[PDB]
Structure 1
Amino acid sequence: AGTAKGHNPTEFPTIYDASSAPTAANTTVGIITIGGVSQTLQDLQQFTSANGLASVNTQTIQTGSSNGDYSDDQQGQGEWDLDSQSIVGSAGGAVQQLLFYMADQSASGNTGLTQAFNQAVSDNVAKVINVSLGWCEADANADGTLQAEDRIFATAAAQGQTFSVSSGDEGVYECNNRGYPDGSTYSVSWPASSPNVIAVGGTTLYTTSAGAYSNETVWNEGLDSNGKLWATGGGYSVYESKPSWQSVVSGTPGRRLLPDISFDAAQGTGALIYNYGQLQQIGGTSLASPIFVGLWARLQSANSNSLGFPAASFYSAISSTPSLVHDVKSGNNGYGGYGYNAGTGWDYPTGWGSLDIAKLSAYIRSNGF
């Protein structure tokens, strides 16, 4: 049912039933970036000004060496644009502050990125932090990145910060040269596979002619002209043990299952984003994560920034209270008859599905989180 089309970020509150919630004006939000954000900040000004919104207070943080390379990565600007504009739109047009935690590009291997995560946790000023990044978890494990970064995310969770991470754009084929079809061989993305973050998968979003929510299916747009799959990451970690709160999803391995929740990701139903001054229609789980971040930041502002790391609460609340989500039921995250299928309740492409924010807010008012 419904129509597939692009959406302005300011539509995400209506789509996900967040209009009645406070904005994120009382919550500080972080974004992890690789390199600088100079063009991104100009595109953010274009965004707020075009949409008639109050200006956003920003800070940029050099997270590594002061001699490091924080120049703009030109392609990267599109990611940081997607992230920042989608957060602010989903947040209802206001955030307390947006902090860009910039990784040094001249640091060895993944150490610049690790240091960006570390700085966000050490500072402990952002309540919610977006990470629209990922790569094969087995590569991260082999070189020690996984272990180093998991320690940082563990500290974040213990201090009550929410890291939100895109589940991946390769469907089940994360480790096969970043998304090439591989039959029955399935893998997942890091850092989404950490049990210390919220992993956010991807949907195809249909809206009614009046712009309301109609339905969501799995994000799976098939292969590009190079032969790479574009679909929501989902599956289970081969390394991370299942956190006890995931025991409510019976019949799954003793591993961290992902994603937890999902939001819009299909390019064909994606966000209209200003990138080097020009509007582009962009998707991915790189979109879904910042949608979650902006919506969650609203709930933080409604709760005096007192909500802790929410994974256990999501699993207990949603399993007992199906009205809190839009349960995705149709589609798959592989190719050629392979991959996982959506179904009733939690599934590997989409986790619990998307949040109905005003219903979740009412639940939190009654029950805590």
Structure 2
Amino acid sequence: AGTAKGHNPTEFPTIYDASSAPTAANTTVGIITIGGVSQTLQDLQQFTSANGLASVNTQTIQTGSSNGDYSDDQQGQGEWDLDSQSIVGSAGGAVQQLLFYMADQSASGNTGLTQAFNQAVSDNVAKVINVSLGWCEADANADGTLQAEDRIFATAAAQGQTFSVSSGDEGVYECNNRGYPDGSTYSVSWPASSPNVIAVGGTTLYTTSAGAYSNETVWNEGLDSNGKLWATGGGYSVYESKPSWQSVVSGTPGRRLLPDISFDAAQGTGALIYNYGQLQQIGGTSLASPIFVGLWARLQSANSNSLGFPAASFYSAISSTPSLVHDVKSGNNGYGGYGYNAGTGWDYPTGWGSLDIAKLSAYIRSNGF
């Protein structure tokens, strides 16, 4: 059913039923970056101007040493472009401010990135923060990055901030040189496996000829020319214990299950993004996470930025209220007959599926969150 095609980010409110909600004009949103965003800010101006939108108020924050390296990473600009344009589109064309928390590129190990997360939590000005990044959780564990960063996310959750993190682009093969098929050996991405963030997986998005939502399947576009798998990350952490709100997914291990929710991720149904002035059709869970961030920021604006970290409420509300989501039922996030399969209700490729924002907003008005 429906058609697979690229989409302007301004289409995401129509697709996920958010047009009747407020924009995110009253909510400040952050984006974690590696290095600078100078070209990204030019591409953002192109984005708002081409779409006839009011300009976005931005700030860039050097999160580490004042002598650090915050030069633009050229390939990185495409990520910060995807993130910023998808947030602003999904938000209905307005955010209060977009803050770019830039990691120092000349810091030791992963310490630049850790310090970027730290600054966003310390400052506590952004209500929702996008993280379209990740890597094998076992590698993060081995060198202590996991432990250091989980402390920061724990503080964020306690203070009511929502970090949104892409679940991964490697399907179940995150730890096998970042997505090479490995049979029955499955792994997950950090920081998505943290119980202190919302992990956002990936769908293949079909729309009707009139541009309305039609259906979603799992994101899995198979192998590229190098033999690497492109599919939604999903599974469970080998380290993190299950938070109690996930007990509603019976028959799963005592571990943090991910993702929590999912949005559009297939390149073939991806977003049209300005990158160094040129439009490109881009996917990944790097796309799905900023869609969530923009939509969630609308719900914050509708609720005076008073909604806390929403994981427990998503699990209780969605398990009891299937109308709040588009339940993905078809596809798998592996290769060669391996990987997890989607199915009725929560599944490992897609978690609960995508949010129907107007229905979720009505739920929140009635029940709180």
The two structures have a TM-score, normalised by structure 1, of 1.00
Tell me the distance in 2 between the aligned counterparts of 1:70 and 1:239. Answer: 33
**Alignment map for 1:76-91 (pairs within 5 Å):** 76-91=76-91
Superposition deviation, residue 162 in structure 1: 0.0
Superposition deviation, residue 202 in structure 1: 0.0
Superposition deviation, residue 51 in structure 1: 0.1
Superposition deviation, residue 82 in structure 1: 0.0
CA deviations 1:302-360 (Å, max 9, x no partner) are 00000000000000000000000000000000000000000000000000000000000
SS of residue paired to 2:339: coil
Tell me the distance in 2 between the aligned counterparts of 1:309 and 1:8. Answer: 29
Tell me the distance in 2 between the aligned counterparts of 1:208 and 1:340. Answer: 28
Superposition deviation, residue 16 in structure 1: 0.0
SS of residue paired to 1:291: helix
SS of residue paired to 1:206: strand
CA deviations 1:21-68 (Å, max 9, x no partner) are 000000000000000000000000000000000000000000000000
SS of residue paired to 1:43: helix
**Alignment map for 1:233-272 (pairs within 5 Å):** 233-272=233-272
CA deviations 1:66-90 (Å, max 9, x no partner) are 0000000000000000000000000
Tell me the distance in 2 between the aligned counterparts of 1:337 and 1:244. Answer: 32
- In structure 2, stretches of 5+ residues that fail to align are none
Superposition deviation, residue 256 in structure 1: 0.0
SS of residue paired to 1:77: helix
SS of residue paired to 1:28: strand
Partner of 1:110: 110
Superposition deviation, residue 362 in structure 1: 0.1
Tell me the distance in 2 between the aligned counterparts of 1:226 and 1:68. Answer: 34
CA deviations 1:111-143 (Å, max 9, x no partner) are 000000000000000000000000000000000
Tell me the distance in 1 between the aligned counterparts of 2:189 and 2:172. Answer: 9
Superposition deviation, residue 299 in structure 1: 0.0
CA deviations 1:145-187 (Å, max 9, x no partner) are 0000000000000000000000000000000000000000000
SS of residue paired to 2:170: coil
CA deviations 1:248-303 (Å, max 9, x no partner) are 00000000000000000000000000000000000000000000000000000000
Tell me the distance in 2 between the aligned counterparts of 1:61 and 1:134. Answer: 21
Tell me the distance in 2 between the aligned counterparts of 1:109 and 1:175. Answer: 18
SS of residue paired to 1:44: helix
Output the aligned Cα RMSD.
Answer: 0.1
SS of residue paired to 1:286: helix
Tell me the distance in 2 between the aligned counterparts of 1:278 and 1:108. Answer: 34
Tell me the distance in 2 between the aligned counterparts of 1:67 and 1:270. Answer: 37
Partner of 1:173: 173
**Alignment map for 1:60-71 (pairs within 5 Å):** 60-71=60-71
Partner of 2:329: 329
CA deviations 1:211-264 (Å, max 9, x no partner) are 000000000000000000000000000000000000000000000000000000
- In structure 1, stretches of 5+ residues that fail to align are none
Tell me the distance in 2 between the aligned counterparts of 1:16 and 1:202. Answer: 14
Displaced runs of 4+ in structure 1, greater than 2 A? none
SS of residue paired to 1:147: helix
Aligned residues: 369
SS of residue paired to 1:205: strand
SS of residue paired to 1:129: strand
Superposition deviation, residue 5 in structure 1: 0.0
Tell me the distance in 2 between the aligned counterparts of 1:316 and 1:249. Answer: 10
Tell me the distance in 1 between the aligned counterparts of 2:335 and 2:327. Answer: 22
Tell me the distance in 1 between the aligned counterparts of 2:73 and 2:118. Answer: 21
Tell me the distance in 2 between the aligned counterparts of 1:136 and 1:251. Answer: 25
Tell me the distance in 2 between the aligned counterparts of 1:253 and 1:149. Answer: 23
The two structures have a TM-score, normalised by structure 2, of 1.00
